[PDB]
Amino acid sequence: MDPGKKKQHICHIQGCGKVYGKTSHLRAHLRWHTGER
Ligand SMILES: [Zn+2]
């Protein structure tokens, strides 16, 4: 849904706390969270 209330992309994972607007960035960012050890 384009209109209506908007939603922000926040790191649901307990640890981070940044802000995102594009979902495509979530993937690139997710790899950093999982790809650690
Ligand atoms: Zn994060």
SS (H, E, C) 1-37: CCCCCCCCEECCCECECCEECCHHHHHHHHHHHHCCC
Separation between Cα atoms, residue 23 and residue 32, nearest integer Å: 15
Q: What residue type is 4 in one-letter code?
A: G
Give the method of determination: NMR
Closest of 15, 8, 20 to residue 33, by C-alpha: 15
Report the separation in Å between the CA atom of 5 and the middle of ligand 1, taken as the mean of its atom positions. Answer: 23
Q: How far apart are CA 26 and CA 8, in angstroms?
A: 12
State which residues have CB under 5 angstroms from ligand 1, the bound ion. 11, 16
Question: Are 26 and 9 a contacting pair, CB within 8 Å?
Answer: yes
Q: What spacing in Å lies between the alpha carbon of 19 and ligand 1's midpoint?
A: 9
